[PDB]
Design a protein around this nucleic acid. Structure first.
Ligand SMILES: [Mg+2]
Ligand SMILES: [Mg+2]
Ligand SMILES: [Mg+2]
Ligand SMILES: [Mg+2]
Ligand SMILES: [Mg+2]
Ligand SMILES: [Mg+2]
Ligand SMILES: [Mg+2]
Ligand SMILES: [Mg+2]
Ligand SMILES: [Mg+2]
Ligand SMILES: [Mg+2]
Ligand SMILES: [Mg+2]
Ligand SMILES: [Mg+2]
Ligand SMILES: [Mg+2]
Ligand SMILES: [Mg+2]
Ligand SMILES: [Mg+2]
Ligand SMILES: [Mg+2]
Ligand SMILES: [Mg+2]
Ligand SMILES: [Mg+2]
Ligand SMILES: [Mg+2]
Ligand SMILES: [Mg+2]
Ligand SMILES: [Mg+2]
Ligand SMILES: [Mg+2]
Ligand SMILES: [Mg+2]
Ligand SMILES: [Mg+2]
Ligand SMILES: [Mg+2]
Ligand SMILES: [Mg+2]
Ligand SMILES: [Mg+2]
Ligand SMILES: [Mg+2]
Ligand SMILES: [Mg+2]
Ligand SMILES: [Mg+2]
Ligand SMILES: [Mg+2]
Ligand SMILES: [Mg+2]
Ligand SMILES: [Mg+2]
Lengths: 187, 233, 216
RNA sequence: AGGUGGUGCAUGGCUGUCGUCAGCUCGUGCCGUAAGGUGUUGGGUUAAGUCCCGCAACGAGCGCAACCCUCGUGUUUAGUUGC
RNA sequence: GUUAUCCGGAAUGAUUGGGCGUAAAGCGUCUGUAGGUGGCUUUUUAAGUCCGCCGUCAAAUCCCAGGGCUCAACCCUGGACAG
């Protein structure tokens, strides 16, 4: 047994102080954050209006990995950051086809947000509206049709999109599920 | 690799019975067995396959070098847990379990920092140079920090295997491991749902004997896996 | 509510005075006057001779001790690269002017410059810094955060910075402030360095208060 | 140049006030689609969010208290201009 | 550029494609005529339904493939899915 003071000072020196160590590491995680929406929500106190900023932000690699996150703070900057951090721990993967599009047609539902995605021919690009389009685009989907029916909340549309592209089954897997060879379902 | 279980020993320690039939979760009806005198009786042929897969994953996990927590907060299981962990040389939770131990690590670990300073203070004998208020205060800090940090006070970093007693009372353990991407190997009585644990062992709640049996088989697996990880690294 | 200048709150406890002399009550007014005249002169001189050569001149403070024979001026200063490096070293060039002002009868004057090692653990300097960056029409957010950075990497336990005025030339004035770490203002045992500075912008004035806490 | 000439609804400094009232918040987590909530609530107790139990919250920061001055008891030391 | 007109966006009259506990919206409650839909098994028929073949749905237009005005608009030849 080595002494308690030097080993606990070893776990003390390996868990670094947050007042002597500055923060910028994030481009080392190979990601890019995109601020979708900034709003000023308010709590009200005997004094007056207590203002905060809500940030709705989505992160992707543009390579087939995407997630959404929401954050709240006093300043634009800090909200943005918490939004990033939250998304990074919520993140999923979008099934892609050799041409960068969706396996199949799909709907989705969250709150009053309904969302419709369907695959497109290569060369049509991504045509959609704000939440759906930023999420799609940040995932790296190159060609997709999308329309949000029902509500317009930016946020619920983001979540909805995620539930859509989460339930996307890729052919190899339906062939694995059904227990039938690929060439048979292709037909 | 093999483990120590037979129908006779499981019969002996009294694993096969569980809570009254007014208290039950039908979610567990798929693997329950019979029902007698308003007391449920749970399948042991399922219990053995689960206990074997449990000890096996426990063996692979110990041998690769992963770290272990155990949890139960009952009165009797708490006394059995300090000894389970010491015999396996692992981390434990027996006394009051704090919400956030796993999920909120950062603040938990600062609480560990100051506990370590308290442990150096106390043995240095520099608590004799204080007012009486200061010593009783430092001793509040100590009493608590011993209750809460005692079994984990070795562990630095996030624990990647968690073992648990009686998931009914332990809701937060299960929640936190559900969240953090940690496996749970858990004791199920007739009242608890088999959602919350990765490997959920049909078991007994009320019996110190059942706890002793299954926990001793498990700690024996952790111990042989401990010899194999003392060998492989 | 109003606070007390936390300077003035610990006086004869954790903080010294600046003018260190004594006088009989009658002379006291005159002596006071004299201190003021030289603090003024020495501020002016350095302001004009350093801001001509384009640098940041921390003049952190001025201690004056009067002795019957010689009166001694100790300048606490953050970067005397602008006062020493010039050919007529600030020592002589000032010694002459200050000795012109106060009198030379029964009083001859000595100037000594002291290097305050950590310039960003002194509020006064730091505030002049933010003053520069804001006079440069940098957004105040950036300014604040840079200051916090510089300071905390310059060895400081706590800091509270407050900027008040028409911020960003916006027509309605306001108050922005940031606390960092731990700033007891009510503990008399706490070594506290405060300072007050004023800034002249296109849009009018801007106040800066800085609190800094160095331990107990 | 000078303006005690206009604007305290263009401003700094400075001060009053609610009130020397016990509050106000923030970090990480968790609950809520979200505004927000929890912490800060519950059982006790305090001059006090004072403090202790309990509790998905764990901690921290500014407040409170304390460190400051003056008046109360003693001891050591120093004795003129006071004894 | 502005105005007028029409369709779009409008899932805002909704077959594809909405709703009716509290947001607009369930007759106060039953009985019942027309009308709509209606369990299982075998056979029959072939009205729907399906597949093949024929007639026609003028030319021009829209769609595909060539050709001509230097290109394009425009013109000309040939042919066809729908329905
Ligand atoms: Mg709906
Ligand atoms: Mg729409
Ligand atoms: Mg104030
Ligand atoms: Mg003028
Ligand atoms: Mg006013
Ligand atoms: Mg009070
Ligand atoms: Mg929070
Ligand atoms: Mg959430
Ligand atoms: Mg509490
Ligand atoms: Mg409150
Ligand atoms: Mg609250
Ligand atoms: Mg509440
Ligand atoms: Mg009470
Ligand atoms: Mg509570
Ligand atoms: Mg307090
Ligand atoms: Mg006080
Ligand atoms: Mg006295
Ligand atoms: Mg329409
Ligand atoms: Mg319809
Ligand atoms: Mg509607
Ligand atoms: Mg109504
Ligand atoms: Mg109604
Ligand atoms: Mg009715
Ligand atoms: Mg009627
Ligand atoms: Mg009827
Ligand atoms: Mg009828
Ligand atoms: Mg019929
Ligand atoms: Mg039928
Ligand atoms: Mg025709
Ligand atoms: Mg053509
Ligand atoms: Mg041509
Ligand atoms: Mg033709
Ligand atoms: Mg036809």
């Amino acid at each position: 047994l080595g002494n308690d003071v030097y080993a606990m000072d070893s776990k003390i020196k390996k868990a670094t102080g947050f007042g002597s160590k500055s923060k910028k590491e994030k481009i080392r995680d190979g990601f890019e954050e995109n601020v979708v929406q900034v709003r000023r929500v308010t709590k009200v106190v005997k004094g007056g209006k207590h203002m905060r900023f809500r940030a709705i932000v989505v992160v992707g690699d543009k390579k087939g990995q995407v997630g959404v996150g929401v954050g709240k703070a006093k300043e634009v900057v800090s909200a943005v950051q918490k939004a990033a951090v939250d998304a990074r721990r919520n993140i999923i993967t979008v099934p892609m086809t050799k041409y960068l599009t969706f396996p199949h047609r799909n709907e989705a539902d969250y709150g009053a947000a309904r969302v419709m995605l369907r695959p497109a021919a290569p060369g049509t690009g991504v045509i959609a509206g704000g939440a759906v389009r930023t999420v799609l685009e940040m995932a790296g989907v190159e060609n997709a049709l999308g329309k949000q029916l029902g509500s317009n909340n930016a946020l619920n549309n983001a979540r909805a999109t995620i539930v859509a592209v989460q339930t996307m089954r890729q052919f190899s897997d339906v062939a694995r599920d059904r227990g039938i060879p690929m060439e048979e379902l292709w037909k | 690799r093999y483990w120590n279980i037979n129908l006779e020993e499981m019969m002996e320690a009294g694993v096969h019975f569980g809570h009254g039939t007014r208290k039950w979760n039908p979610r567990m009806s798929p693997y329950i067995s019979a029902k007698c005198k308003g007391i449920h009786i749970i399948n042991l042929t399922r219990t053995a396959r689960f206990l074997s897969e449990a000890c096996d994953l426990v063996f692979d996990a110990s041998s690769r070098g992963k770290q272990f927590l155990i949890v139960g907060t009952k009165n009797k299981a708490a006394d059995s847990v300090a000894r389970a962990a010491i015999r396996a040389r692992c981390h434990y939770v027996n006394k009051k379990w704090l919400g956030g131990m796993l999920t909120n690590w950062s603040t938990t670990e600062t609480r560990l920092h100051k506990f370590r300073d308290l442990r150096m203070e106390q043995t240095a004998g520099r608590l004799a140079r204080l007012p009486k208020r200061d010593a009783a205060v430092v001793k509040r800090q100590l009493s608590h920090l011993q209750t809460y940090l005692g079994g984990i006070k070795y562990m630095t970093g996030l624990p990647d295997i968690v073992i648990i007693v009686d998931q009914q009372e332990e809701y937060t353990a299960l929640r936190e491991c559900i969240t953090l991407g940690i496996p749970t190997i858990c004791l199920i009585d007739t009242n608890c749902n088999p959602d919350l644990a990765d490997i959920s062992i049909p078991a007994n709640d009320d019996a110190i004997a059942s706890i002793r049996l299954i926990l001793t088989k498990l700690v024996f697996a952790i111990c042989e896996g401990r010899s194999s990880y003392i060998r492989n690294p | 509510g109003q606070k007390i200048n936390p300077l003035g709150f610990r006086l004869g406890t954790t903080q010294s005075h600046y003018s260190l002399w004594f006088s009989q009550p009658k002379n006291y007014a005159e002596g006071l006057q004299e201190d003021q005249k030289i603090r003024d002169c020495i501020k002016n001189y350095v302001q004009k001779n350093t801001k001509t050569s384009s640098g940041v001149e921390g003049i952190a403070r001025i201690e004056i001790q009067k002795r019957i024979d010689l009166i001694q001026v100790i300048i606490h200063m953050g970067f005397p690269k602008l006062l020493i490096e010039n050919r007529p070293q600030g020592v002589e060039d000032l010694k002459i002017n200050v000795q012109k002002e106060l009198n030379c009868v029964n009083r001859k004057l000595n100037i000594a410059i002291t290097r305050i090692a950590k310039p960003y653990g002194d509020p006064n300097i730091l505030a002049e810094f933010i003053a520069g960056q804001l006079k440069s029409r940098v957004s105040f957010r950036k300014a604040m955060k840079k200051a916090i950075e510089l300071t905390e990497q310059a060895d400081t336990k706590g800091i509270q910075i407050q900027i008040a005025g028409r911020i960003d030339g916006k027509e309605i004035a306001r108050i922005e402030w940031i606390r960092e770490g731990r700033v007891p203002l009510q503990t008399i045992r706490a070594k506290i360095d405060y300072c007050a500075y004023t800034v002249r912008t296109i849009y009018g004035v801007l106040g800066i208060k800085i609190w800094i806490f160095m331990g107990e």
